[PDB]
Design a protein around this ligand. Structure first.
Ligand SMILES: Cc1ccccc1-n1c(Cn2nc(-c3cc(O)cc(F)c3)c3c(N)ncnc32)nc2cccc(C)c2c1=O
Length: 835
């Protein structure tokens, strides 16, 4: 069985486990056994969970960030159902009580405590339970706003337990730090030079030192000493030595980093061969500290670390052993002059005692190239009060490379709710890329959270799996996924089923791409359907959890409704239906291969976050933050928003249609009227107005560009939403400041088809202003999350200029009054542009 599980982990993660063995690497070996133990202990805990706790693990609640309500309720093993009038303020227990009383009357009564049950949403992996009014559950809210009757199933605790059960598994060294540069074996045109620097995060620990110049041969020889302007004793624990090999008459060729201490805190010595990474400001301190795995091809640098005595970084116990104030004035950009730094440092105890949230500022002023100073910082850090989540998120930035700081940040982040963790998971995964060692507090934190919440576990898996084609992270991410699989054998098989479906979709899309070059769309479509109706495809593509949202069940693939877009990357449109789910089982996924989906997903997650922040302040802008999930090399899934069309399509203004128009400016309003006749129209126009305000503000703040009428859609409900986000932060395809945008046809709908309607139009302006002012108040959250996202290496999120864009859009250097005046100037400028 162990062999079997080993082969399925290998297949699931995209890497053979024998490849870990072949490295014969103690660090890999230690990571694997330790994390295996950790994860297996998590599994043992899970299998003995109480039944309600099991539900919290496998089906965590979906909550929103008096009134009449009809609900249909049936019991697990029956077609017989009951429709009940309850209240939106009623709790699940009261509803379950009604169900059990009816069951007792219809089926003659003994009878049975509602406390023995939970309510499943029919045909979904989603459950309603807990002391929450029905209107606090997203599902109930969904139905209320869309009009539908909630359909729920009474599921007994013994049924839940069966699910659980079926799913079981030294200061002494004063001399200058020096190295010997020996030789290389590379390819260029000039002479060669090696630049080397010592870094602690972004900060240089002393000036960089450079090689002598040597002719551009294939196997250069230097045999030279590089001495650095720092004492061996002052090397901080997380010191990085960074190399750049380049040609000079400058032509960059390669780079390589390593830690000066190994994973066991031993100071490194003596000889190393550094397999370099090809060069895409020469030195790359944020780059990985592990060598390039393509040793057959990679340029290589051979160096010598001198045996300076075995020496280890001192233990914490040893480390610990070792007037009326402008303080407050400067202490709220955050960049300071040298004298200001001295004051903060001098006043470090006062920072700790009275301004614990200014830790980052203090950290940025400590001299990391002086061991006494670091000791003095660590001493205060070991007694530092826990910080808020927001503050901890900042402390994960590559600017804070020290391991004790890293560990402090994680400690402060443990109070993250699962909902918050889910909101920030993308960024936390990216931060793994900054880690210096395999076994680290971030990795253990994420694994523990993932093992305790199957939804976290699902998205953690896919975030790691989607990057296995990236050599720099393949090893780390492969190891994390293996350990995770050790912690849930059952979830591994659920994930394999998703991977099988994705393998078939890739093969299907490759066929579609070939066929559509040779024949008409109707013909390729019929060929697609014949391919899908093969038993191997019908089986692989049916009965899985959606990778986009594991609570959505993709049951029967609906072949006749599947198609493809006959342009660009030819993405597939795949429809599903589910008898048990009814209408809500009719769902679609888009499979696209050829584009990197990371930027689309990041934009959508930021829009989701805006929607949550707005809703927390009682503002619902009726947004459509649909799912988007990278799954592989320029491959992933996008959630289909049904009953929606593009503005472009509507504006075609085809004849013989319900929307056909005397003036093109009436096409959209006509379309809305056709979908929302009579009294329904007023609601739809309001839905349009709200969502238009949300998207106007979202795209302005994020600097979203390349917006045509084919990348804005509208739902039949009236909700406008943007799709397919290729460009943001003013980087348009170079760097411009994107203005606020008001489109005339949209203003026309908001004004209910009237030329002048200041009453409706100024309401819309008020929504935009409210939305903008709310985001400003959380400005730091967006700044911190985008800073962490720099780890992803998106070309439109690369540097400080990109993050400056958000500082300017949110006008965070301004007062709230000043920011609004400025926003109004932009809104007004945007208004006159409107024809
Ligand atoms: C549904 C529709 C109406 C008008 C014009 C285009 C489309 N449409 C669209 C428009 N579109 N694009 C997206 C979309 C969004 C993304 O962020 C990324 C992406 F690649 C696609 C989308 C979505 N999520 N939900 C609903 N419609 C969406 N996408 C398709 C993708 C694959 C295959 C097909 C046949 C389509 C497709 O027909």
């Amino acid at each position: 069985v162990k062999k079997l599980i080993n082969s399925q982990i290998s297949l699931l993660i995209g890497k053979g486990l024998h490849e870990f063995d072949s490295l014969r690497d103690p660090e890999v070996n230690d990571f694997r056994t330790k994390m295996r133990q950790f994860c297996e202990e998590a599994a043992a805990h899970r299998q003995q969970l109480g039944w309600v706790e099991w539900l919290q693990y496998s089906f965590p609640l979906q909550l929103e960030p008096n009134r009449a309500l009809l609900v249909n309720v049936k019991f697990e093993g029956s077609e017989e159902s009951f429709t009940f009038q309850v209240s939106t303020k009623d709790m699940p227990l009261a509803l379950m009580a009604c169900a059990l009383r009816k069951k007792a009357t219809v089926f003659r009564q003994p009878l049975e405590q509602p406390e023995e049950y939970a309510l499943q949403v029919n045909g979904r992996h989603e459950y309603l339970y807990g002391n929450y009014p029905l209107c606090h559950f997203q599902y109930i809210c969904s139905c209320l706003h869309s009009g539908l009757t909630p359909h729920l199933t009474m599921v007994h605790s013994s049924s839940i337990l069966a699910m659980r059960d079926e799913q079981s598994n030294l200061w002494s060294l004063e001399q200058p730090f020096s190295i010997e540069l020996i030789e290389g074996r590379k390819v260029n045109a000039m002479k060669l030079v090696v630049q080397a620097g010592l870094f602690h995060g972004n900060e240089m620990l002393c000036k960089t030192v450079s090689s002598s110049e040597v002719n551009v041969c294939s196997e250069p020889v230097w045999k030279q000493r590089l001495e650095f302007d720092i004492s061996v004793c002052d090397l901080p624990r997380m010191a990085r030595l960074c190399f750049a090999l380049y040609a000079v008459v400058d032509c960059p060729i390669a780079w390589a980093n390593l830690m000066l201490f190994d994973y066991k805190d031993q100071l490194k010595t003596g000889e190393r061969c550094l397999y370099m990474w090809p060069s895409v400001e020469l030195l790359n301190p944020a780059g990985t500290v592990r060598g390039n795995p393509n040793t057959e091809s990679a340029a290589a640098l051979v160096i010598y670390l001198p045996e300076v005595a075995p020496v280890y970084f001192p233990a914490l116990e040893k480390i610990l052993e070792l007037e009326e104030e402008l303080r407050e004035i400067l202490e709220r950009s955050g960049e300071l002059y040298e004298h200001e730094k001295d004051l903060v440092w001098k006043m470090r105890h006062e920072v700790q005692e009275h301004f614990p949230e200014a830790l980052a500022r203090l950290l940025l002023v400590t001299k990391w190239n002086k061991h006494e100073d670091v000791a003095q910082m660590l001493y205060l850090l070991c007694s530092w009060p826990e910080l808020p989540v927001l503050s901890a998120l900042e402390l994960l930035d590559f600017s804070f490379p020290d391991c004790y700081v890293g560990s402090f940040a994680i400690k402060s982040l443990r109070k993250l709710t699962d909902d918050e963790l889910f909101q920030y998971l993308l960024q936390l995964v990216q931060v793994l890329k900054y880690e210096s060692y395999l076994d680290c507090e971030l990795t253990k934190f994420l694994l523990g959270r993932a093992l305790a919440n199957r939804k976290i576990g699902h998205f953690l898996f896919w975030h790691l799996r989607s990057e296995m084609h990236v050599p720099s992270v393949a090893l780390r991410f492969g190891l994390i996924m293996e350990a995770y699989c050790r912690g849930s054998t059952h979830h591994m098989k659920v994930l394999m089923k998703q991977g099988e479906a994705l393998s078939k979709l890739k093969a299907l899309n490759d066929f579609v791409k070939v066929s559509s070059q040779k024949t008409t769309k109707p013909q390729t479509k019929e060929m697609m359907h014949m391919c899908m109706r093969q038993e191997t495809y019908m089986e692989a593509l049916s009965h899985l959890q959606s990778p986009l949202d594991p609570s959505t069940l993709l049951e029967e693939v609906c072949v006749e409704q599947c198609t493809f877009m006959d342009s660009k990357m030819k993405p597939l449109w795949i429809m599903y239906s589910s008898e048990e789910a009814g209408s809500a089982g009719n769902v679609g996924i888009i499979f696209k291969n050829g584009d990197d989906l990371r930027q689309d997903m990041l934009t959508l997650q930021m829009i989701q976050l805006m929607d949550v922040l707005w809703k927390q302040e009682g503002l619902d802008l009726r947004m459509t933050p649909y799912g988007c999930l990278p799954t592989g090399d320029r491959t992933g899934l996008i959630e289909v928003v049904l009953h929606s069309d593009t503005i472009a399509n509507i504006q075609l203004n085809k004849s013989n249609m319900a929307a056909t128009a005397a003036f093109n400016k009436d096409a959209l309003l006509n379309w809305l009227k056709s979908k929302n006749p009579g009294e329904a129209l007023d609601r739809a126009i309001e839905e349009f107005t709200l969502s238009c305000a949300g998207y106007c503000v979202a795209t302005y703040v994020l600097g979203i560009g390349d917006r045509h009428s084919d990348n804005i859609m509208i739902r039949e409900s009236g909700q406008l939403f943007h799709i397919d986000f290729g460009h943001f932060l003013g980087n348009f395809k170079n760097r411009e400041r994107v203005p606020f945008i008001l489109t005339y046809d949209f203003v026309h709908v908001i004004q209910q088809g009237k030329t002048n309607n200041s009453e409706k139009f100024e309401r819309f302006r008020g929504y935009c202003e409210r939305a903008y002012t709310i985001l400003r108040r959380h400005g730091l959250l967006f700044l911190h999350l985008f800073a962490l996202m720099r780890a992803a290496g998106l070309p439109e999120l690369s540097c400080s200029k990109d993050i400056q864009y958000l500082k300017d859009s949110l006008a965070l250097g301004k007062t709230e009054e000043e920011a609004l005046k400025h926003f109004r100037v932009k809104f007004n400028e945007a208004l006159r542009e409107s024809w």
